[PDB]
Amino acid sequence: LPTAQEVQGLMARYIELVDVGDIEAIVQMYADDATVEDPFGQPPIHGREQIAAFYRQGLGGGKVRACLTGPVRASHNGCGAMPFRVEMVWNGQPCALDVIDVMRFDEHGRIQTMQAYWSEVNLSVREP
Amino acid sequence: LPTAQEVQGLMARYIELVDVGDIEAIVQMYADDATVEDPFGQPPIHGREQIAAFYRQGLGGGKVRACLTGPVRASHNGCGAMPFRVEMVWNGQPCALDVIDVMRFDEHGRIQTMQAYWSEVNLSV
Ligand SMILES: C[C@]12CCc3c(ccc4cc(O)ccc34)[C@@H]1CCC2=O
Ligand SMILES: C[C@]12CCc3c(ccc4cc(O)ccc34)[C@@H]1CCC2=O
């Protein structure tokens, strides 16, 4: 499993990929059998193909940005959690959404599970 | 289960209690049979007695400070995650540790599970 430092690097890279919107690069970070729960509480997304469609829907449209708003917290069992902000335009309204992603990586350094904690209480109208 | 807004309030209150070292109040926020994994990766402890002993050893001194460093993220199923920083002493010198706690609340508004994400990579001098 990736070391604590490696997890910090991997999770930070993920945010960089989301920020630029490189869908294919994001999908490649996931294990072909990964699961995504975003927002946490909803039915999971299973596998590369479904995950690709998920990111294309979320990042393939209007301009979206993402940035860490604090350091990645990493564990010694291939897991980590990170706080970040996502910016987007919702029907003309400039918005910001605060999120925390928790990830578990496998022995190949790929994301096995991702859980995104957030809800409408974390949304707000704000200029980019 | 607590609503998303209620989760935000409960988790913020927890940090306030940690900051002042109110062990008794912290323990009461947990379900009687709750589990704590801190740091996540280590074996979980079970029950209020074990949890109380854990917090007594961690905050017993009285020189530990804690504060949210970002908003509490909350779900619609009684769960939340929050980023915070704790300040204490390491090797006889002021230090800081960045942590993210993930909590699940039960139907009675008590913490059923807490998982604290952090490691040495989050410790600064
Ligand atoms: C889809 C989305 C843009 C990207 C995004 C959202 C929420 C959680 C995320 C978690 C991630 O790890 C990466 C991207 C997002 C937003 C929900 C509303 C929106 O426009
Ligand atoms: C115990 C401790 C102070 C408080 C604290 C730590 C780690 C995770 C925590 C998680 C919490 O939800 C509340 C308090 C802590 C530190 C580990 C080293 C230290 O001095």
Q: Which residues of B67-85 are buried (b: 16+ CB within 10 A; e: fewer)?
A: ebbbbbbbbbbbbbbbbbb
Q: How far apart are CA B58 and CA B50, in angstroms?
A: 12
Partners of B117 on chain A (C-beta within 8 Å) are 73-75, 79-81, 102
Q: How far apart are CA B22 and CA B25, in angstroms?
A: 5
Locate B81 and state its tokens. Answer: 């995650």
- The owner of tokens 């990579």 is B121
8 A C-beta contact, residue A39 and residue A27: no
Q: How far apart are CA A81 and CA B8, in angstroms?
A: 18
Beta bridge partners of A13: none
Flag if A100 and B82 touch (Cβ within 8 Å): yes
Residue ranges of A for the binding site for substrate? Answer: 101
Q: Residues A22, A30, A33, A38: which is the catalytic one?
A: A38
Going by C-beta distance under 8 Å and a sequence separation of 6 or more, which residues neighbour residue B19? B64, B65, B66, B67
Looking at ligand 2, which atom is closest to the CA of residue B89? 20
Locate A31 and state its tokens. Answer: 């294990």
Q: What is the CA radius of gyration of chain A?
A: 14
Closest residue to A121, CB basis, from B4, B39, B118: B4
Phi-psi region of B52 (alpha: psi -120 to 50; beta: other; left: phi over 0): alpha
Question: Is B14 a catalytic site residue?
Answer: yes
Q: How far apart are CA B80 and CA A57, in angstroms?
A: 25
Question: Is A14 a catalytic site residue?
Answer: yes
Q: What is the DSSP letter of B108?
A: T
* Number of domains chain B contains: 1
List the end-to-end C-alpha distance of chain B, in Å, as a whole number: 39
Task: Say if B1 is an interface residue toward chain A (CB within 8 Å).
Answer: no
Flag if A74 and B4 touch (Cβ within 8 Å): no
Cis-peptide into B39, omega within 30 deg? yes
Going by C-beta distance under 8 Å and a sequence separation of 6 or more, which residues neighbour residue A16? none
Sign of CA dihedral B37, B38, B39, B43: negative
The number of beta carbons lying within 10 Å of the beta carbon of residue A43 is 6
- Resolution in units of Å: 1.1
Instruction: Tell me the one-letter amino acid at B79.
Output: C
Question: Which CATH number goes with the domain that contains B72?
Answer: 3.10.450.50
Task: Say if B120 is an interface residue toward chain A (CB within 8 Å).
Answer: yes
- The owner of tokens 């854990």 is B54
Per the structure, the complete domain to which residue B94 belongs is given by 1-125
Closest residue to B81, CB basis, from A5, A76, A117: A117
Locate A99 and state its tokens. Answer: 């999120």
3-class state of residue A50 by DSSP = helix
